[PDB]
Amino acid sequence: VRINVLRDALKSICNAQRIGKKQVIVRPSSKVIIEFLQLMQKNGYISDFAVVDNHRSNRIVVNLIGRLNKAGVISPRFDIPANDIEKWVVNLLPSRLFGHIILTTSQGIMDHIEAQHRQIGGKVIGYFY
Amino acid sequence: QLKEADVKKMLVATTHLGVRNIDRRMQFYIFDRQKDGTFVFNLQKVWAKIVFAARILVTIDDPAEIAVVANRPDAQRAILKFCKYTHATAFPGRFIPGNFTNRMNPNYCEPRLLLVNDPVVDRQAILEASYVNIPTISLCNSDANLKFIDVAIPCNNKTPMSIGLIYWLLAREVLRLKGSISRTEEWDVKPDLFVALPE
Amino acid sequence: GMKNSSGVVVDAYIPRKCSATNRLIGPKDHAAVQLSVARVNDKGKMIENNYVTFAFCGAIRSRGGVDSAFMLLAQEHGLME
Amino acid sequence: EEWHPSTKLGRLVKAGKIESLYDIFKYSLPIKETEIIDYFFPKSELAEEVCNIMSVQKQTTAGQRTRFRAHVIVGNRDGFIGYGAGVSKEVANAIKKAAKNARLNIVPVRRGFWGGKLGDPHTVSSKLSGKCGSVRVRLIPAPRGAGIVASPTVAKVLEFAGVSDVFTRQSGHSRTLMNSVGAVYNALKSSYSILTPDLWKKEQLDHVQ
Amino acid sequence: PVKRRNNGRSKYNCGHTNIVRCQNCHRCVPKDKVIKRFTIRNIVDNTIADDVLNACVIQGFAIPKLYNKVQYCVSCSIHNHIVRVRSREDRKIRTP
RNA sequence: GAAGGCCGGGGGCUAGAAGGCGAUCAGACACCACCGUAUUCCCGGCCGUAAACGGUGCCGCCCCGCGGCCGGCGCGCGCGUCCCGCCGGCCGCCCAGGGAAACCGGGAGGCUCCGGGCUCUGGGGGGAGUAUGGCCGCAAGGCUGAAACUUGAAGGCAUUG
RNA sequence: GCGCUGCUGCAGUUGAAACGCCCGUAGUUGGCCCCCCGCCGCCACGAGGAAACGGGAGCGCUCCAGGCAGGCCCGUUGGAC
Numbered sequence: 001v002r003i004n005v006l007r008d009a010l011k012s013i014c015n016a017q018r019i020g021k022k023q024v025i026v027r028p029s030s031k032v033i034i035e036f037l038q039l040m041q042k043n044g045y046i047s048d049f050a051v052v053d054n055h056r057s058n059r060i061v062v063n064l065i066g067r068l069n070k071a072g073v074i075s076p077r078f079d080i081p082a083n084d085i086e087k088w089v090v091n092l093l094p095s096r097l098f099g100h101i102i103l104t105t106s107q108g109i110m111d112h113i114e115a116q117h118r119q120i121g122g123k124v125i126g127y128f129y
Numbered sequence: 130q131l132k133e134a135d136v137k138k139m140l141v142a143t144t145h146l147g148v149r150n151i152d153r154r155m156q157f158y159i160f161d162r163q164k165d166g167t168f169v170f171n172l173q174k175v176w177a178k179i180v181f182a183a184r185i186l187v188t189i190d191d192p193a194e195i196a197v198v199a200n201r202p203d204a205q206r207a208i209l210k211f212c213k214y215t216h217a218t219a220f221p222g223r224f225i226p227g228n229f230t231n232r233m234n235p236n237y238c239e240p241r242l243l244l245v246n247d248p249v250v251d252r253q254a255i256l257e258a259s260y261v262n263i264p265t266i267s268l269c270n271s272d273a274n275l276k277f278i279d280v281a282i283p284c285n286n287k288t289p290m291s292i293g294l295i296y297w298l299l300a301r302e303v304l305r306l307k308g309s310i311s312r313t314e315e316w317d318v319k320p321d322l323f324v325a326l327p328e
Numbered sequence: 329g330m331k332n333s334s335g336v337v338v339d340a341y342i343p344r345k346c347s348a349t350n351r352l353i354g355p356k357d358h359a360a361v362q363l364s365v366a367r368v369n370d371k372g373k374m375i376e377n378n379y380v381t382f383a384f385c386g387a388i389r390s391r392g393g394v395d396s397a398f399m400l401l402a403q404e405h406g407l408m409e
Numbered sequence: 410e411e412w413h414p415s416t417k418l419g420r421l422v423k424a425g426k427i428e429s430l431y432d433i434f435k436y437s438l439p440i441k442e443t444e445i446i447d448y449f450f451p452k453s454e455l456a457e458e459v460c461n462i463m464s465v466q467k468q469t470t471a472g473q474r475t476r477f478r479a480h481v482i483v484g485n486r487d488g489f490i491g492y493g494a495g496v497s498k499e500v501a502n503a504i505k506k507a508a509k510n511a512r513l514n515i516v517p518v519r520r521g522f523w524g525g526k527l528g529d530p531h532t533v534s535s536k537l538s539g540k541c542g543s544v545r546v547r548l549i550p551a552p553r554g555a556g557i558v559a560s561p562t563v564a565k566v567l568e569f570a571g572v573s574d575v576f577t578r579q580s581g582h583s584r585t586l587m588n589s590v591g592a593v594y595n596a597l598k599s600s601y602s603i604l605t606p607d608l609w610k611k612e613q614l615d616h617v618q
Numbered sequence: 619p620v621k622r623r624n625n626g627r628s629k630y631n632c633g634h635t636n637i638v639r640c641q642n643c644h645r646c647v648p649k650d651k652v653i654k655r656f657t658i659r660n661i662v663d664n665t666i667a668d669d670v671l672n673a674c675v676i677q678g679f680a681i682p683k684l685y686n687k688v689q690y691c692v693s694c695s696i697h698n699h700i701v702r703v704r705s706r707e708d709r710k711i712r713t714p
Numbered sequence: 715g716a717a718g719g720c721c722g723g724g725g726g727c728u729a730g731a732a733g734g735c736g737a738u739c740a741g742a743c744a745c746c747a748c749c750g751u752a753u754u755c756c757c758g759g760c761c762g763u764a765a766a767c768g769g770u771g772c773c774g775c776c777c778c779g780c781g782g783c784c785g786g787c788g789c790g791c792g793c794g795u796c797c798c799g800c801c802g803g804c805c806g807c808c809c810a811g812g813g814a815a816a817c818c819g820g821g822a823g824g825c826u827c828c829g830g831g832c833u834c835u836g837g838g839g840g841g842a843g844u845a846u847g848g849c850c851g852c853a854a855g856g857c858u859g860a861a862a863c864u865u866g867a868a869g870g871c872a873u874u875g
Numbered sequence: 876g877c878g879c880u881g882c883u884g885c886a887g888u889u890g891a892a893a894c895g896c897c898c899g900u901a902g903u904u905g906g907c908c909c910c911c912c913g914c915c916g917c918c919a920c921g922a923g924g925a926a927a928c929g930g931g932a933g934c935g936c937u938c939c940a941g942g943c944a945g946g947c948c949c950g951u952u953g954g955a956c
């Protein structure tokens with residue numbers, strides 16, 4: 001059965017971007033998907049998107065610009081102590097200069113840079129570069 | 130802009146008639162299907178494509194760097210006249226593999242643009258061009274595979290008249306764009322030269 | 329455009345980007361081509377020697393569809409639209 | 410006697426029209442003459458090295474026919490590396506063919522910083538992975554002064570390419586030398602083909618060349 | 619390794635098929651794996667068909683035919699040249 | 715839960731383990747020919763194994779192109795069991811991609827750029843699916859399942875002879 | 876060393892290895908939706924609680940392994956954390 005909607009959405013996004021398309025459709029929308037896409041947009045990776053209301057698990061349409069290189073999720077959301085982020089950065093990201101790691105905290109969904117700025121920790125959701 | 134004379138010439142030339150098969154990458158050029166099943170092209174689309182190809186051709190300053198390849202017996206005459214009037218280079222007959230990668234081949238050249246009449250019959254040269262960063266423009270029928278085909282001209286390419294007519298129109302357009310001739314006066318050359326003659 | 333600590337670019341060279349897929353073209357991509365299209369005066373029949381340039385990577389060419397991309401790009405850059 | 414260009418690019422290089430190798434690489438123009446580089450590399454800035462020499466046999470009606478396969482790498486220690494192989498009935502002729510092939514194929518190497526930026530680049534731009542046969546390689550940027558943590562064979566390639574800090578991991582049958590060298594060569598080759606946020610700048614194309 | 623994609627038989631959407639007996643050796647073979655040919659022949663060889671027609675008293679008579687379906691096993695077909703061992707590329711050909 | 719096998723009753727034509735006999739052979743108690751018991755068939759009940767194979771666990775998402783067949787439904791007209799589609803199923807070829815390769819591409823893809831969920835199995839070759847225990851079964855046997863000792867290779871795909 | 880015990884991080888068409896198939900309890904995993912209330916997990920901080928070892932501030936046992944010292948006009952000299 002369907003479990004992780006975000007994983008399906010990200011896989012579809014990468015599949016479409018691989019063959020140089022311009023628009024993708026994701027079926028089951030959700031708040032977490034919307035925040036993930038908002039962060040991606042803010043960092044300049046996927047331009048804009050729209051949500052279509054059908055009264056049943058709204059759909060969503062996104063527009064690409066051939067900048068995204070890889071996106072993914074960590075299924076069992078482990079807890080990241082505020083001082084245990086550099087290990088994950090080294091393990092997951094190509095470099096310490098570019099790339100982002102998404103965490104959910106009591107203060108909301110934020111990039112790992114922001115969490116390092118505020119010296120707090122939380123749970124890991126995904127990553128992209 | 131398409132004129133009545135041009136459309137009537139194309140219709141008498143049976144240029145808009147294709148084949149029973151269809152490809153998903155050409156459905157945009159298809160306008161209708163006949164009762165038997167033959168597909169019907171769109172004259173405005175092919176005209177716009179011819180104009181675009183003529184522009185691309187005139188972008189090259191030296192006509193000697195353009196290669197015209199055709200293994201079809203019917204095309205030979207049309208390509209020969211096209212190159213003679215445009216002062217380009219022709220590769221009639223069989224295409225020797227290694228003509229573009231083997232520098233020791235007696236007939237070896239470095240073209241900048243390549244022109245083909247049928248990918249199926251001339252696929253050997255298309256790959257060779259793909260090895261050396263050479264764009265290609267080809268004449269594609271209803272069922273064509275556009276692997277490494279930059280520009281596709283939607284036209285018939287089996288009837289002897291259609292082959293000669295398209296080349297004649299292309300030569301006319303390129304010469305006009307070059308400024309040698311004007312649009313209003315009909316070209317002195319008649320299309321019958323490009324069509325192959327029996328016996 | 330990898331800047332130094334002083335803002336001085338230290339990249340050897342900036343490679344080209346496909347005009348459709350926005351993808352870097354590698355030094356060894358031998359199926360990568362670049363074309364030009366000529367501009368036409370008001371009277372027609374004449375080129376003004378102003379050309380617009382495009383570049384395409386090998387992957388899109390192999391997969392096809394470069395024709396549709398070229399059509400849309402020309403329409404966006406010209407009156408064909 | 411004198412070198413007679415057999416190609417348009419060769420003739421242009423004979424003239425002073427082209428002034429640098431990056432002007433060739435940026436258009437993905439193939440190189441077919443060994444002179445196209447030595448004219449750009451006259452001084453002994455580059456260096457050649459023989460990696461491995463293996464003998465291969467072909468059974469026949471009466472005994473075996475033996476031959477030698479050779480592998481050679483070349484680089485200037487400044488963002489340039491090449492790798493080639495050659496086979497011939499004589500060891501020296503195989504070495505010459507391998508050296509010519511290594512010279513023929515060459516790629517630039519992108520170099521970057523680990524964390525802090527200061528001075529010239531010293532390590533690979535990011536993580537680079539390569540594949541050949543069963544062998545996979547990983548190159549992770551390292552801090553300044555960390556040296557090259559790699560096997561003797563791969564370390565020679567890294568030194569020739571001009572990299573002073575890097576962490577390496579090898580997987581698969583690494584005792585097959587040619588496949589490991591090919592994997593590292595491909596990983597290095599991929600460097601100038603990965604898009605980064607610094608390269609997002611949109612530049613208009615130039616009609617000239 | 620695997621030599622054929624069909625595994626040497628035409629078996630789709632099923633688990634078992636009825637068996638048949640080879641007409642030369644009487645081996646038991648699956649129906650989908652046996653080599654089958656249909657033949658139509660005159661009861662009388664064409665050499666003496668004219669002679670028989672000359673001798674026949676009936677007017678408007680027609681020579682009757684024989685309709686038989688021959689089934690052979692893999693070993694016997696090769697031995698009797700009903701099928702041949704082909705090259706790797708020719709194995710994909712399905713036309714007579 | 716194939717076939718064979720067992721228990722208790724029916725039935726008895728073909729074929730045919732065992733057995734007999736004629737040939738072949740140096741030998742032939744085997745291959746070939748002939749006769750022929752159990753069995754092959756039905757009823758009730760045990761056994762619970764097969765190359766029980768697509769040698770590919772189940773649920774779910776995305777995904778090049780061309781084509782054939784089966785079932786159902788809708789559209790169009792010049793009304794043909796025509797052609798344009800949708801869902802489900804069975805197949806063929808195949809660009810990318812993947813792989814040690816053969817090859818797969820309705821995945822064996824989206825994976826060292828290596829995290830969707832659940833269950834089972836494996837850790838060099840023999841000794842050995844053996845010994846000893848336990849459960850099951852009328853039995854034949856099935857499930858579970860070592861150690862000492864020994865050994866430097868055993869295997870897969872492909873190339874030339 | 877060994878990503879040959881694999882959470883990070885193995886393999887299961889052909890090399891060793893997907894139960895013959897179905898139902899099914901324990902177990903594990905479970906679409907989307909309400910801005911502010913309660914509880915559980917989670918993150919941060921804090922209190923409380925032996926040192927030695929380990930890290931670490933300062934000091935020229937001639938250096939070092941070490942130790943907690945020394946000169947003078949000493950943070951109340953110091954042995955902080």
Ligand SMILES: [Mg+2]
Nearest residue numbers: 619620621622
């Ligand atoms: Mg075999």
Ligand SMILES: [Mg+2]
Nearest residue numbers: 632633634635
């Ligand atoms: Mg079966």
Ligand SMILES: [Mg+2]
Nearest residue numbers: 717718719754
């Ligand atoms: Mg039975």
Ligand SMILES: [Mg+2]
Nearest residue numbers: 767769893894
């Ligand atoms: Mg099995």
Ligand SMILES: [Mg+2]
Nearest residue numbers: 825828829884
């Ligand atoms: Mg994995």
Ligand SMILES: [Mg+2]
Nearest residue numbers: 837879885886
């Ligand atoms: Mg193992």
Ligand SMILES: [Mg+2]
Nearest residue numbers: 837838839891
């Ligand atoms: Mg073992």
Ligand SMILES: [Mg+2]
Nearest residue numbers: 869870889890
């Ligand atoms: Mg086996």
Ligand SMILES: [Mg+2]
Nearest residue numbers: 889890891892
């Ligand atoms: Mg096995």
Ligand SMILES: [Zn+2]
Nearest residue numbers: 640641642643
């Ligand atoms: Zn037979």
